[PDB]
Symmetry: D2
Amino acid sequence: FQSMMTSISLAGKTAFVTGGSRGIGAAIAKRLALEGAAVALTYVNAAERAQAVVSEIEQAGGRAVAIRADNRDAEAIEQAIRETVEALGGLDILVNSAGIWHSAPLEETTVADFDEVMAVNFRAPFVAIRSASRHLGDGGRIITIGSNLAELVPWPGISLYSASKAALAGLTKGLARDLGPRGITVNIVHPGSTDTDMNPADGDHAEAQRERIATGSYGEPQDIAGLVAWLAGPQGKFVTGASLTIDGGANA
Amino acid sequence: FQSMMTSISLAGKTAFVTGGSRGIGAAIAKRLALEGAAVALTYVNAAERAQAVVSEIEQAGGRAVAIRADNRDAEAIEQAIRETVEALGGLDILVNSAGIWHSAPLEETTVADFDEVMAVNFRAPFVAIRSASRHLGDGGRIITIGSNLAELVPWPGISLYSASKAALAGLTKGLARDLGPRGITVNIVHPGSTDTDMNPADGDHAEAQRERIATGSYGEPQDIAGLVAWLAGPQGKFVTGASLTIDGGANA
Amino acid sequence: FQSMMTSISLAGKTAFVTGGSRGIGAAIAKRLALEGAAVALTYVNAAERAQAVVSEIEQAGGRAVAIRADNRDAEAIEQAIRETVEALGGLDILVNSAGIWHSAPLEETTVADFDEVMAVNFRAPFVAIRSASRHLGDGGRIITIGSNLAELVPWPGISLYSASKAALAGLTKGLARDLGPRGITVNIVHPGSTDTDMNPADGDHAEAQRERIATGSYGEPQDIAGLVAWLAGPQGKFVTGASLTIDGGANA
Amino acid sequence: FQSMMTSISLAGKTAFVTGGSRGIGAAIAKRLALEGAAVALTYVNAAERAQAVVSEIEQAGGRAVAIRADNRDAEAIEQAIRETVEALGGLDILVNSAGIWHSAPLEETTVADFDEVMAVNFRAPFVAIRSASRHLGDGGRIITIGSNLAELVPWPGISLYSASKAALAGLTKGLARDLGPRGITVNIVHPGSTDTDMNPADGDHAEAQRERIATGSYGEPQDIAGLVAWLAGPQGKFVTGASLTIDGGANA
């Protein structure tokens, strides 16, 4: 029992979660802290929201800090990581969960739009990974939040966003090979339609997404956080280089 | 806490596990019973082994029954399911875990070999699913054990086995659509090299498999059982139609 | 020029095409004969249709024979192959194109339905492959016709058909390993909605399929035949173990 | 006959091929010109090599121009495209074939390395596509050269390169949706080990790659050019959003 509960536990692990101020990232930072991890979560400008996530985690008995780090700035990410390490003792779990949504007709998409989507969706995860990777040891975890649009693109208008997430899945396989011999697993979780600010369960346009879902409704951030928390702990030890889609069957 | 532990729990659920006498199947039947499920497990002729798995589950505080049901015989499977339902009260979780291994040079493979591999690897899961499916309700779970050879075939000699597992993944997507509106999730877990009788961590031929693994060693049946148990419970509710590979990175 | 036209040519090759009496199979048998292959095509009971395909091929200057061989009967397939070899001189190209469509609510699908779909969709291609394989040499070609439903299942009701085609893709990878060292390529082509008797470009239900297609219309049997003919010839030599989807973007 | 040869022909089409000075790109520019396309090919600094490819195409009876356009500079790409259009009359076929190889231990990979790999491997194809796309009409073709490392990463050291190619496959699906209603197909071809300057059929390290190949040897640039030429012409009309792997079975 208590042995299987040792199976679930993250006590003594330090997590770094980008995009921890809201939606999926905040739900992950909370679930990781619920299982015992000390959590550093980052935010770009939403200072108050990030502090309130730290307060919720403290109220439920956990430990957390909010650090300001603009994902466009590699130095800011690397400093945030160094700070986490110094303040919380080490770094055992990295979760990349700071993606931004983008949608527009191709005829209205510029080269600056590509540059902007990639700087945050694709380049900022690589920066965090390459820097977290000096600190991680045997038992370390890297989990990236992708999208089910990484595998299947049903609509026009979303090439940049879809591509940024497909790139992360390809980066994930190659990083699993790099970090495997050190005992670190590297995986990517692909959420489907999840009731958030970025993607409200109320349409407009919810219906097109909702229609796809085999089990009939949008999921919740908590669904994604539970898969991340399972991967982050001892039971995820034989999963690496993997893509795990959690999308209600939209992609079936 | 206790709320998240409600998150993990299978108390009150009845599971039916094919191939529960050994390897992965026995580890799943035990982990499901550890989380509270009452477990019916089936076996073809290994009566003593199946009874000893039931005894281990009883000793740790759970409830289980062993039922004889030859996977080659559709009627035997359907009877086993009817029996489970009558004895244990209903049926909430189906796990298909009775695959057999097959390997041979193509020039030595007969049509009878195809027929034999498929009868047990592919047809027996469909039979169990179609029969379990009258009994499952909102919250039901179907989980099939596939193989990482379903997605990637690195060697000659294994076309039948690989194909039988790829067929199950395609059956899984279509069944997720069928059973989704009823609130049932249908997924497939693809284990890589797992230290078992079917696949001993000692070579011959272990090395070719071991070399592929990013994290450097064969996994254990318990690794697969923990992913199955997570999918089987409340935290798996937004995962369906999915393939989940748990193979140490062999497929990266 | 003439060198690139040597690039396209199948002169001197013997092809065996199952399902050559109609739709995709007939278009393939004709395109292969147009490029110079002598073609044996099989049929189950549509004797007149198969003879008229042979007449069309003869009128355009090619050579072809129609052989009766029920795909449910392994001996009939193997005899048809032996006959082809004796009458046409050898066997260089196998195309499996005799699938049957199946669709039904899961609650109305029986074990006999599974058995029936698989006997023709999955087992009959393996039988033809295992028997053609003694005759093929360096430069040989195996091409199977799958379906885009092998990779993506958007609807309920089609689990058996989808699974039978996913099984063929997994069989294809393993057979590519088996037959590679002999210089034989083994591939699978996945057609999307193709204007045929099995799938008329006129709805009912055409619209649901048509809506998916990125380029806006159903394709034609000739589209599939041109990809098969390209794979069958010298330019396909470095393609093997591959899945090639030709579906107007339905699966994007 | 001549009708099927109309089937193969690119007469009257203008192609723009990045990386046309060498390896795969030069073989594509030549095969496209052999089938009748007028070809603009680009190069970054290898002026002499690019001119000699133009001379070979002229000697065999075709039309071609070499244009200098550094793939790091979006304006240079867009100018090259405007020039092609003005000099050759329009633009019907875009082939992105200017990737660079990158390999290094993760501990020696910098953020500047990521930036550099992506600027050329991922961003330069998007720039060319977004600019070519005003000029393409019904019947237009976009073909990108990816890598089989986009789907399967067997080794450490290649995360950036693999990711850049996986990103292109995800961009391809989304662009197929964008450009489909206009009658333009968008596909990606994934070459495996192809005997080039970038990847010589002589080891060091050839052997690790060669061992994977089901048919036993490295392919040739001409193999890739023949699949590109087939996609570029009328017979590719029902293929779009597709990934086509041409790798001798390495990925099976």
